[PDB]
Every structure is written in C-alpha cells, then in structure tokens.
Amino acid sequence: SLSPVLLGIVWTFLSCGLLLILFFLAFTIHCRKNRIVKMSSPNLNIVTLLGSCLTYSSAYLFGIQDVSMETLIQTRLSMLCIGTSLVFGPILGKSWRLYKVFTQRIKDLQLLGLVAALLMADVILLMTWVLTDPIQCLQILSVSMTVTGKDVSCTSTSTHFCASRYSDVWIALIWGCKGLLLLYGAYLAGLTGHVSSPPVNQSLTIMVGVNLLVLAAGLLFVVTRYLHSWPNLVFGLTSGGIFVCTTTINCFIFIPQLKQWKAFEEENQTIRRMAKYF
Amino acid sequence: SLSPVLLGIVWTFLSCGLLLILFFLAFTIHCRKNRIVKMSSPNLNIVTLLGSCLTYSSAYLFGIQDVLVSMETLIQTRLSMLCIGTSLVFGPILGKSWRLYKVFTQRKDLQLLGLVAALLMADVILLMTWVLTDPIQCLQILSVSMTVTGKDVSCTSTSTHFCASRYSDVWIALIWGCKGLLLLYGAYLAGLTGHVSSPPVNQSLTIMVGVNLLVLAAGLLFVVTRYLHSWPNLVFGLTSGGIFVCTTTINCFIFIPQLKQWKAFEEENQTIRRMAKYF
Ligand SMILES: CCCCCC/C=C/CCCCCCCC(=O)OC[C@H](COP(=O)([O-])OCC[N+](C)(C)C)OC(=O)CCCCCCCCCCCCCCCCC
Numbered sequence: 362s363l364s365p366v367l368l369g370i371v372w373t374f375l376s377c378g379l380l381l382i383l384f385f386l387a388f389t390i391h392c393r394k395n396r397i398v399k400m401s402s403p404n405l406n407i408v409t410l411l412g413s414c415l416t417y418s419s420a421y422l423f424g425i426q427d428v429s430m431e432t433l434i435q436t437r438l439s440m441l442c443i444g445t446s447l448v449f450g451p452i453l454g455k456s457w458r459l460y461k462v463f464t465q466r467i468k469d470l471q472l473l474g475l476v477a478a479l480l481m482a483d484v485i486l487l488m489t490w491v492l493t494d495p496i497q498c499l500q501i502l503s504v505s506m507t508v509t510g511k512d513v514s515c516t517s518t519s520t521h522f523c524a525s526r527y528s529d530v531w532i533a534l535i536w537g538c539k540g541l542l543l544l545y546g547a548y549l550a551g552l553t554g555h556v557s558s559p560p561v562n563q564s565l566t567i568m569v570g571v572n573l574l575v576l577a578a579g580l581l582f583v584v585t586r587y588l589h590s591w592p593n594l595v596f597g598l599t600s601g602g603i604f605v606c607t608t609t610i611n612c613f614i615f616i617p618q619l620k621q622w623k624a625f626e627e628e629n630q631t632i633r634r635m636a637k638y639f
Numbered sequence: 640s641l642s643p644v645l646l647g648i649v650w651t652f653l654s655c656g657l658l659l660i661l662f663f664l665a666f667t668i669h670c671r672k673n674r675i676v677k678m679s680s681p682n683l684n685i686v687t688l689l690g691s692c693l694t695y696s697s698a699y700l701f702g703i704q705d706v707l708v709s710m711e712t713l714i715q716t717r718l719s720m721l722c723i724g725t726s727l728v729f730g731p732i733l734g735k736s737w738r739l740y741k742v743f744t745q746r747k748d749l750q751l752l753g754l755v756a757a758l759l760m761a762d763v764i765l766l767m768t769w770v771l772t773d774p775i776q777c778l779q780i781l782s783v784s785m786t787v788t789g790k791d792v793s794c795t796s797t798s799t800h801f802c803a804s805r806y807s808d809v810w811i812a813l814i815w816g817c818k819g820l821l822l823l824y825g826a827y828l829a830g831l832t833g834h835v836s837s838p839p840v841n842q843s844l845t846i847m848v849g850v851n852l853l854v855l856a857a858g859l860l861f862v863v864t865r866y867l868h869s870w871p872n873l874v875f876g877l878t879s880g881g882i883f884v885c886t887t888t889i890n891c892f893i894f895i896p897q898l899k900q901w902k903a904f905e906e907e908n909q910t911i912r913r914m915a916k917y918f
Pocket residue numbers: 416438439441442445448496522523524525527528529531532535536537539540541543574575577578581582585586599602603606607610
C-alpha cells in the first residue's frame with residue numbers, strides 16, 4: 362500500500378544519514394588522541410552514534426507493512442526509545458561534567474553509569490509494557506447509534522489497528538520520563554551557558570535537540586493517531602522527523618569538531634612549511 | 640453524584656489556598672515600596688497571583704457534576720481557565736528570570752508585560768480555535784463490537800455517555816506542546832541564572848520545581864481522566880489535589896523567601912531603632 366517512489370526516497374535519505382553517522386564514527390575512532398577530538402569526550406560520542414544508528418534502523422523498520430506484526434511494532438518502537446535515550450544520555454553527561462569542573466571540581470565510568478541507569482529506566486518501562494499488555498492487532502467491526510440529545514445518527518465502521526488496551530498510559534509514561542530528562546537537560550544547557558567553545562560546550566545542541574524532539578513527537582503522535590488512513594503520509598512524516606532530528610543533533614555535535622580539527626592541522630601544516638623553508 | 644465529604648474537604652483546601660493567595664496579594668500591594676519587595680517584581684507578582692486565583696477557581700468548577708444538565712460550556716470554561724491561569728502563573732517568572740539574566744549580561748516591566756501578553760495571546764488563539772472549530776459535545780453512544788483476533792472472536796455491548804471533542808488529542812498535543820516548549824525555555828533560563836543572586840531575586844529553584852511538578856501532574860491527570868471515568872470521586876479529588884499542590888508550591892516558593900527577608904529586615908530596623916533610643 363506504500364508507493365515504491367516514497368520508499369526509495371526515504372531509504373536513500375536514511376542510508377545517507379547512516380553513512381554520515383559511520384563517517385563521524387570513523388573520524389572519532391581514528392582521531393581519538395587529537396587534542397580537539399580528545400577534549401570533546403570521544404568515548405561518550407560512540408554511544409551517541411550508536412543510538413543514532415538504532416534510530417535510523419527503527420526509521421527503516423517503520424516502512425514495512427504486511428509482515429508477526431505485533432513483534433515488528435514493539436521492536437521498532439523499543440528500538441526508537443532505546444536509540445533516543447542513547448543519543449541524549451551522553452550529551453547530558455558531557456554538560457554535567459563541564460558544569461562540575463567549572464564549579465569547584467569525573468571519570469567516563471561514572472557518566473556511563475548514569476547513562477546506564479537512564480537506559481535501565483527505559484528498559485524497565487518497555488519490559489513492563491510488553492509483558493503487562495502487548496500490542497495485539499484486532500479487527501473491530503461495530504454498529505454505533507449516536508444520541509446527542511437533539512439528533513440521532515447511526516454509523517457502521519469496520520476498522521483494524523495495532524495497539525494496546527491501555528496505550529495512552531504507556532504513552533504518558535514514556536513521554537513523561539523523557540520530558541523530565543529533557544527538562545533537566547535544558548537546565549544543564551543553561552548552567553553551562555557560554556562557558557566554553559561549541560565543541561566542548563554542548564548547550565545549543567541540547568536546546569535544538571529537545572525542541573525538535575518535542576515538536577516531532579507531538580506531530581507524529583497526532584498524525585499516527587488520526588491520519589491512519591494515509592499510510593504514505595504517516596510513513597514519510599515519521600521517517601522525515603526521525604531523520605531530521607537525528608541528523609541535526611549529530612551535525613551540531615560533530616561539525617564544530619571537524620572544522621576545528623581542519624584549522625588545527627592547517628596551522629600545523631603552516632608551521633611545518635615554515636620549518637622546511639628555513 | 641459526588642460524595643459530600645470529598646466535596647467539603649476539597650472546597651476547604653481550595654479555600655485555604657485562595658486565602659493564602661489573597662494574603663500574598665495584600666502583602667505585595669501593601670509593601671510595594673519596601674526594599675525587599677521592590678528588588679523583586681511586585682507588578683509581575685500580581686500577575687502570578689491572579690493566575691493562581693484563576694487556577695484555584697477552575698478546581699472548584701471541576702467538582703460541579705450532574706447539575707447543569709450547559710455541561711459543554713462548563714467543561715470548556717473550566718479548561719480555558721486552567722490554560723490561562725497556567726500562562727499567567729508561569730509567564731511572569733520567566734520574565735523575571737530573563738530580566739535578571741539580561742541585567743548581569745550586558746554589552747522594564749512594560750516589555751515583560753508585553754512578552755507575557757504575547758504568551759497569553761498564543762493560548763487565546765489556541766483556545767478560540769479549539770472552541771470554534773471542534774467544540775466539546777456531550778454525546779451518548781450505544782454500540783456493539785465484534786472483536787475478532789487472529790483466532791478468537793468475542794462480542795461486547797457498550798453504552799457510554801462522555802463529553803469530549805471529536806479531535807481532542809489534536810488540541811491536547813497542541814496545548815501540551817506549546818506549554819512544554821515554553822517550559823523548556825524556562826528551564827534554560829533557570830539554568831542561565833543558576834547562581835546569579837538570592838532566591839528572592841533568583842527564580843531557578845521555583846522554575847525547576849514548578850516545571851517538574853507541572854509535567855508530572857498533567858501526565859497523571861490526563862491518564863486518570865481518560866481511563867478512570869468510572870471513578871468520579873477519584874478523578875475529581877486527584878485533579879483538585881494536583882491543581883492545589885502545583886499552585887500552592889509555586890506561590891510558596893515565590894513568596895515565602897520575600898516574607899523571611901522582609902521580617903529579617905524589619906527586625907534589624909527595630910534593633911537599630913532601639914540602639915538609637917539607648918544613645
Ligand atoms: C533523536 C531521534 C528520536 C526522535 C524521534 C521522534 C519520533 C517519534 C515517532 C514515534 C512516536 C509516535 C508513534 C506512537 C506509537 C504508535 O505508533 O502506535 C502504536 C501504539 C499506540 O497506538 P495509537 O494510540 O497511536 O493509535 C491507536 C488509536 N486508538 C484509538 C486505538 C487508541 O503504541 C503504544 O501502545 C504505546 C507505545 C509506547 C512506546 C514508546 C514509543 C516510541 C518513543 C520514541 C520517542 C521517545 C523520545 C521523545 C519523547 C518526547 C519528548 C519528551
């Protein structure tokens with residue numbers, strides 16, 4: 362039921378995003394010991410890039426329709442939740458470390474432990490969601506007689522959807538926990554405001570990321586809920602929102618590093634040129 | 640409909656909160672030239688207290704049930720009052736934080752009043768669009784559904800009467816979304832002014848406590864209103880308690896330090912007056 366053209370366009374965009382993420386991974390693994398890369402916590406960037414990979418994979422999984430379907434939907438939604446937690450944890454840890462060293466001074470292990478607890482919260486919520494009530498797909502046909510007190514109307518609808526019995530409670534939980542995390546992250550971004558350079562100070566990236574996150578989540582929640590008879594629109598909007606948010610966050614993280622690195626080695630090459638000239 | 644004991648208890652608690660807001664308003668207006676009050680923003684504190692009054696008033700309206708047999712406009716007005724009251728409570732705090740940040744980062748109440756006026760105009764245009772496009776309708780629907788799984792088939796008979804909008808989750812996501820973006824910017828502002836001055840002038844702790852309590856209460860009350868419509872006492876008590884807790888906590892965090900630092904100032908004044916009388 363999905364157009365091949367839209368599928369091809371979305372897959373090409375997601376593959377280009379994955380290639381960009383892999384390029385950033387190669388850059389931050391190869392140039393680990395460089396000053397510009399080393400001062401930007403290259404170990405905590407691996408977790409962000411891994412979460413970005415998970416988010417892109419879930420965006421891919423959002424595009425297959427027919428074939429169970431419950432396992433597919435749970436898999437892609439849990440992949441999205443895990444990937445976004447892994448993307449946003451390291452940034453918050455970096456901001457917290459910058460705040461702590463600035464304010465009357467943290468190893469990578471403690472930050473990774475905090476990120477692991479953050480991930481465990483999501484794992485607990487997803488596990489209790491999957492076990493308490495799965496996302497079983499039901500074919501619903503019914504006849505409804507509407508009485509508003511002034512007019513009588515009758516309608517017969519045969520609808521099919523994949524959802525939980527109490528899906529809004531799990532929604533409100535996941536949205537709520539992520540929102541508390543984002544509020545604390547915005548507080549951290551404010552605290553480490555104009556405290557250092559962009560590659561070290563992850564403050565604009567946090568604000569852009571949380572704003573895009575809230576906007577995309579609201580839009581896609583509404584669109585999935587109500588425009589379910591527009592499969593191409595829902596698929597395109599979901600994939601575009603995931604792609605835009607992930608690509609924007611990763612670009613904000615890594616482009617400053619790339620340009621500062623280019624300037625650093627250009628200066629080193631000029632120094633070597635001067636040494637060779639004499 | 641609703642138990643008289645729960646109604647009485649909720650009304651007592653809301654009345655006590657409203658009297659506390661009235662006392663804070665009297666303190667702000669009376670001592671508007673005092674140094675501790677003046678270095679705060681009494682004109683903006685008045686707006687915060689008026690928003691608190693609106694939020695306390697809406698909690699009373701949440702307890703009216705099976706009286707206006709008129710029920711649609713009651714829900715519309717109680718929810719619009721909550722939205723406007725939250726805007727009026729939180730806008731002034733953000734304006735005070737922004738003014739503090741801009742004063743100490745250099746290279747005014749009318750401007751902040753204009754900013755919060757725009758903030759309230761956003762909610763006004765959202766609420767007007769909600770009412771005019773998709774208003775609440777109190778409709779009774781009886782229906783039978785033949786729920787069939789991959790291998791199992793069952794039938795159910797449901798007859799329900801609820802007052803809600805046709806595209807209710809659209810307006811929910813919109814208002815929740817705009818409020819959440821403003822609260823994210825408020826958290827950013829609280830971070831920017833994290834340790835810039837004292838709690839009477841600095842509003843970081845009040846902002847963070849308020850946004851956390853607000854998100855938690857809204858998330859709880861959305862779910863319980865949606866899924867526990869068969870528990871009128873529970874939903875009424877929980878909604879009133881959440882509104883009361885949020886408003887009371889925010890206003891106490893704003894105004895108690897003012898009272899503390901005003902009483903200390905007055906005590907110092909009295910001590911020096913007594914020493915002057917001695918000599
Ligand atoms: C950094 C990159 C990451 C950001 C990407 C943002 C994109 C989000 C799109 C996915 C969310 C919409 C889909 C909702 C679920 C669905 O498809 O329906 C199946 C169902 C709900 O179906 P339904 O209710 O939408 O439709 C049925 C309507 N009916 C009338 C029957 C009720 O899912 C559930 O039951 C709930 C599952 C919760 C699991 C978590 C979801 C993924 C979380 C990813 C975002 C978390 C981070 C951001 C949080 C926001 C900021 C605080």
